[PDB]
Design an enzyme around this catalytic site. Structure first.
Site, mmCIF file in Angstrom:
data_model
loop_
_atom_site.group_PDB
_atom_site.id
_atom_site.type_symbol
_atom_site.label_atom_id
_atom_site.label_comp_id
_atom_site.label_asym_id
_atom_site.label_seq_id
_atom_site.Cartn_x
_atom_site.Cartn_y
_atom_site.Cartn_z
ATOM 1 N N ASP A 1 -20.783 1.950 29.201
ATOM 2 C CA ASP A 1 -19.585 1.461 29.633
ATOM 3 C C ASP A 1 -19.152 2.046 30.050
ATOM 4 O O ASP A 1 -18.287 3.302 29.687
ATOM 5 C CB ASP A 1 -19.212 0.141 28.394
ATOM 6 N N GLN B 1 -8.864 2.682 33.050
ATOM 7 C CA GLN B 1 -7.302 2.077 32.930
ATOM 8 C C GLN B 1 -6.278 0.883 33.824
ATOM 9 O O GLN B 1 -6.164 -0.393 34.117
ATOM 10 C CB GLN B 1 -6.585 2.565 31.485
ATOM 11 N N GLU C 1 -9.789 -7.243 28.981
ATOM 12 C CA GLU C 1 -9.015 -8.406 27.479
ATOM 13 C C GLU C 1 -10.588 -9.064 27.851
ATOM 14 O O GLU C 1 -10.449 -10.405 27.905
ATOM 15 C CB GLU C 1 -8.220 -8.770 27.988
ATOM 16 N N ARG D 1 -8.497 -3.642 19.101
ATOM 17 C CA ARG D 1 -8.485 -3.015 20.332
ATOM 18 C C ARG D 1 -7.898 -1.956 20.730
ATOM 19 O O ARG D 1 -7.085 -1.494 19.833
ATOM 20 C CB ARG D 1 -7.773 -3.857 21.277
ATOM 21 N N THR E 1 -16.952 -5.597 21.984
ATOM 22 C CA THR E 1 -16.787 -6.206 21.277
ATOM 23 C C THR E 1 -18.913 -5.963 21.035
ATOM 24 O O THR E 1 -19.413 -5.640 20.297
ATOM 25 C CB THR E 1 -17.183 -7.874 21.230
#
Ligand code: GTP
Ligand code: G1I
Ligand code: MG
Lengths: 55, 334, 335, 282
Positions: free
Chosen positions: B163, B167, B41, B141, B46
């Site tokens: 990237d 998780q 987060e 998201r 972005t």
């Protein structure tokens, strides 16, 4: 979710009741295998250069 | 004879193959690779979307995030109008199949008409929900496993930024692979000084980021790779500092003794307070950087807003310095 | 919930007591009268060049003449040891690769890595093309092995191991029980059982047909990066990150012997046996390879021809040469 | 005594030059890690220095110790020509190394694409060809020979030969061999120093609040070469323009001072830890 805990305690039960043998017997079996098959080990006893594929 | 014919074809193929690798070798040495490490987060995805600007299935997905947001806020309430809708939300709280129907969607706006959103720290939710409840593509998201790679070309050089996503990634072992990367673009959240991590008590989210930074800074394999630091989410920091609630000094007691740096380029029109904080966050981050490195490590801090600020030139400008310092050190001219 | 914890403590101590009642004597004492092997020295015969980046995998062929290597350059090259000739250079969609395989029939080659997806190619069609794309999984893969032309077994970092099906592209069965990332595996000679070394300092003995675990060994103290098998099929050697290698036994369910040295403080990346299971070659992170003795723990040769760390190792099925890959984009053949 | 003793002193110098350059030549080729784009120039410089030490130093020492040259007139003309070749080619390599370093430092993005093995080979071959054209062709063709009573007597006499040159050849050789690369190297190293100072200022500004290395390195690199070679080429023009101010003793002394730059070069250059590790291994 304690059921996940329940699954863990069942598995140990199966693995506990299995047959075992003495360490000496396994060591003797390994000794016999190595002694029998040491002859056909090119890395141990070098092969003649006339029969060496890479040379 | 026949054997001589057999040898001839193979030699030509080795000759043909070896020609092809020679052409590809030049391209490999002309590409600079960057690794986009960060924290959950933090808005790292972005940046990638803004980088795909150089060079309608999701719309169905956005609703699913909205459904998750409604469930989390309603569950958070336990911690009378449309009470049946509140019961209906509990009734529709966990339907694993798709949830197409309008009446829940209508009911949801009515239920909102409450203060649960204000107590963000007490529970865990999604940042994107406030925009969804009341660019759009980057707002949503999505959690996905796999490496997202973007190749973009600027000023006759090629950059391949990728990237890596985990998780539940912890005690990472794939970090050994990235030894030849030009730089690591570390992204942090500057508005997470008053929020918990995962709803587990954990610590201030930033304290997790600083602990992650220490592990990255001191590593046997990453002993010769520079780090570019981005302080994302600048807009939200200004609002929280202006707001009376969530006092900075309470969660970080060391802020009381801190003073403003002698050197500053406070932005235009910035109150001596929002600004003061900004530097603290930065210094806290640098303190670890200056302790070690022995001239093979450097940290380049920045202050960015992912939504609006353009940042393509900053990466290019600093990347020319990283290579320059490496060549200076090798030749002992430095 | 707390009541079930009481049974775990009693059950765990039962196994330790039973194991301790079967240790008649140490392995070293039995083989104390065996004459030492002596000194073993081997030199580089061939050097293989052409890779643009570091190497993580290597696997010989059934004919013991061809081998395959993988790198971060996006290439999957197949060499020829006898003449030092490249035969195929396969481009890759993803530049990150962590494993490779070679089917016994010599027709298919597998690959995988950080893309969470295992890919299968077809050498003998004449253009190399993708055949299947096994994609239902999570986490980076670590190893791939071929049973036959239709079966493949894969392990990854999501604490699972699965047996796939090339024709249908679905998991026939799945194996669970590990609490950490799985890093290595290999099959038994009869292709009926296989083990897996994880990051929780433990090894397990699975069953392909049954789909359930059978035994668990927890003799190590850190992560495990490689694992092998004795040619007999009743033992396997594990090399962990604690600068040590251990040999276990399936029938005895105990740790038989330990290889370690005080002057070595680096982890192990790969281990392998010899044709007769006498020399236990093991890679190391300090830029060279050491040759151990499977029953004496006596070093009998060091291979220090490399300029970086060793990430893979293998022995031909004919027991004629040893191939070692490294991070300097160079392969070597020793004999 | 002293004359015999001095010859033994010069014998020690010749041994160091032959062994010093031999170590660099063998180590670079033996190890694949030491091979690089910038090491080809170092290998060429080492080869030139080794050829100098093997060819011109022992024969020059014999000519100094024994009054009369014994091999012959043609052979000592060959000796002078090869001496000119070995001297000329050694200097221009350092200029190439400086230019390569400047390209690496100032323009980092295009350095990898600009320089390749073929380009380096072409540059080295062109440099050697240019050095050969100036050395062998005029010396062997007797164009440089001057017309003077002592000069013509020495040229006709086969007892011994000594260096007597024409004004035009002296000026052209001195200029092309020394002066053209000198200003180039000076500008290169000044620009490099300015870039290094700017980078250090940036580092100090970024995280200063919580430049001896460049000066020392540049001082060594420039001053050693300058102090070794400049006086000889500053008296070369002098003894030809004016009327016999210098004697042959100071001339030959300055030449022998300029010789030891080849011996000093292996210590000055290639001092990286990798070279030390390779030397320790072998
Ligand atoms: N105020 C503000 N919010 C931002 C900014 N950049 C990103 N955000 C917020 O953060 C979101 C970015 O997605 P995240 O929830 O961080 O998720 P992600 O980018 O996929 O990152 P991971 O969770 O680490 O995978 C945006 O939709 C915004 O809600 C910024 O500059 N200012
Ligand atoms: C006496 N030997 C020669 C004579 C002149 C000369 C030398 C070197 C470089 C030159 O450019 C020269 O003109 C000397 O090595
Ligand atoms: Mg992600």
């Amino acid at each position: 979710s304690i059921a996940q805990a329940r699954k863990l305690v069942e598995q140990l039960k199966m693995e506990a009741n299995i047959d075992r043998i003495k360490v000496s017997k396994a060591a003797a079996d390994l000794m016999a295998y190595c002694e029998a098959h040491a002859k056909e080990d090119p890395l141990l006893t070098p092969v003649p250069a006339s029969e060496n594929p890479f040379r | 004879e026949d054997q001589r014919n057999e040898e001839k074809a193979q030699r030509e193929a080795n000759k043909k193959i070896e020609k092809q690798l020679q052409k590809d070798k030049q391209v490999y040495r002309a590409t600079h690779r960057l690794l986009l490490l960060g924290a959950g987060e933090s808005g790292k995805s972005t940046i990638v979307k803004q980088m795909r600007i150089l060079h309608a299935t999701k719309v169905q997905d956005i609703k699913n995030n909205l459904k998750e947001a409604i469930e989390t806020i309603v569950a958070a309430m336990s911690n009378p109008e449309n009470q049946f809708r509140v019961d209906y939300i509990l009734s529709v709280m966990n339907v694993p199949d798709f949830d197409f129907p309008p009446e829940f969607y209508e009911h949801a706006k009515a239920l909102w008409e409450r203060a649960c959103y204000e107590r963000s720290n007490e529970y865990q939710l999604i940042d994107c929900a406030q925009y969804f409840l009341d660019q759009d593509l980057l707002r949503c998201r999505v959690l996905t496993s796999g490496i997202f790679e973007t190749k973009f070309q600027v000023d006759k050089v090629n950059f391949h930024m990728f990237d890596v996503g985990g998780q539940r990634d912890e005690r990472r072992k794939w970090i050994q692979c990235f030894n030849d990367v030009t730089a690591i673009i570390f992204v942090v959240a500057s508005s997470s000084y008053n929020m918990v991590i995962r709803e587990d008590n954990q610590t201030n989210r930033l304290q997790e980021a600083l602990n992650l930074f220490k592990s990255i800074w001191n590593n046997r394999w990453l002993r010769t790779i520079s780090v570019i630091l981005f302080l994302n989410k600048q807009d939200l920091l200004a609002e929280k500092v202006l707001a009376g609630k969530s006092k900075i000094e309470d969660y970080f007691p060391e802020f009381a003794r801190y003073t403003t740096p002698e050197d500053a380029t406070p932005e235009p029109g910035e109150d001596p307070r929002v600004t003061r904080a900004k530097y603290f966050i930065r210094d806290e981050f640098l303190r670890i950087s200056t302790a070690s490195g022995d001239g093979r490590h450097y940290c380049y801090p920045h202050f960015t807003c992912a939504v609006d600020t353009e940042n393509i030139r900053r990466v290019f400008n600093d990347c020319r310095d990283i290579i320059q310092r490496m060549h200076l050190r090798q030749y002992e001219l430095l | 919930l707390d009541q079930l914890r009481q049974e775990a403590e009693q059950l765990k101590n039962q196994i330790r007591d039973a194991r301790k009642a079967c240790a008649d004597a140490t392995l070293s004492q039995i083989t104390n009268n065996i004459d030492p092997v002596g000194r073993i020295q081997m030199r580089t015969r061939r050097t293989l060049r052409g890779h643009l980046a570091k190497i993580y995998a290597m696997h010989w062929g059934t004919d013991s003449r061809l081998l395959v290597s993988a790198s971060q350059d996006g290439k999957l090259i197949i060499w020829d040891s006898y003449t030092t000739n490249k035969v195929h250079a396969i481009p890759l969609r993803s530049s990150w690769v962590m494993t490779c395989a070679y089917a016994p029939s010599g027709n298919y080659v597998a690959c995988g890595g950080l893309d969470n997806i295992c890919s299968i190619y077809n050498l003998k069609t004449g253009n190399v093309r993708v055949s299947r794309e096994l994609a239902g999984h999570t986490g980076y893969l670590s190893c791939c092995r071929f049973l036959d032309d239709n079966q493949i077994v894969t392990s990854s970092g999501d604490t699972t191991c699965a047996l796939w099906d090339i024709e249908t592209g679905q998991q026939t069965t799945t194996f669970t029980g590990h609490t950490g990332d799985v890093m290595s595996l290999s099959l038994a000679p009869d292709t009926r059982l296989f083990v897996s070394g994880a990051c929780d300092a433990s090894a397990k003995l699975w069953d392909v047909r049954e789909g359930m675990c059978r035994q668990t060994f927890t003799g190590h103290e850190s992560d495990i990066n490689a694992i092998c098998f004795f040619p007999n099929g009743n033992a396997f050697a594990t090399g962990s990150d604690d600068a040590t290698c251990r040999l276990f036994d399936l029938r005895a369910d105990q740790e038989l012997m330990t290889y370690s040295h005080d002057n070595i403080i680096c982890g192990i990346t790969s281990v392998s046996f010899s044709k007769s299971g006498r020399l236990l070659l093991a890679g190391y992170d300090d830029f060279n390879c050491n040759v151990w003795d499977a029953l004496k723990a006596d070093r009998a040769g060091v291979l220090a021809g490399h300029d970086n760390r060793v990430s893979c190792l293998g022995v031909t099925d004919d027991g004629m040469a040893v191939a070692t890959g490294s991070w300097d984009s160079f392969l070597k053949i020793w004999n | 005594v002293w004359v015999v003793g001095m010859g033994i002193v010069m014998s020690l110098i010749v041994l160091a030059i032959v062994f010093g350059n031999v170590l660099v030549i063998t180590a670079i080729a033996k190890f694949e890690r030491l091979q690089t784009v910038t090491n080809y120039f170092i290998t060429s410089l080492a080869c030139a220095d080794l050829v100098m030490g093997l060819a011109v130093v022992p024969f020059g020492a014999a000519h100094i110790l024994t009054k009369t040259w014994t091999f012959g007139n043609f052979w000592c003309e060959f000796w002078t020509s090869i001496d000119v070749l070995c001297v000329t080619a050694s200097i221009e390599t350092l200029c190439v190394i400086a230019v390569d370093r400047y390209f690496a430092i100032t323009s980092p993005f295009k350095y990898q694409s600009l320089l390749t093995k073929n380009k380096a080979r072409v540059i080295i071959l062109m440099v050697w060809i240019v050095s050969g054209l100036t050395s062998f062709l005029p010396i062997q063709m007797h164009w440089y020979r001057a017309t003077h009573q002592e000069a013509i007597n020495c040229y006709a006499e086969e007892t011994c030969c000594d260096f007597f040159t024409n004004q035009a050849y002296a000026i052209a050789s001195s200029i092309v061999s020394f002066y053209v690369p000198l200003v180039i190297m000076v500008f290169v190293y000044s620009r490099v120093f300015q870039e290094a100072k700017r980078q250090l200022q940036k580092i100090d500004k970024s995280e200063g609040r919580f430049e001896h290395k460049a000066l020392k390195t540049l001082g060594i690199i420039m001053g050693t070469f300058t102090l070794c070679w400049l006086p000889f080429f500053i008296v070369n023009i002098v003894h030809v323009i004016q009327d016999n101010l210098i004697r042959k003793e100071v001339y030959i002394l300055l030449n022998w001072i300029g010789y030891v730059n080849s011996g000093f070069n292996p210590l000055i250059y290639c001092r990286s830890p990798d070279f030390r590790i390779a030397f320790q291994e072998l």
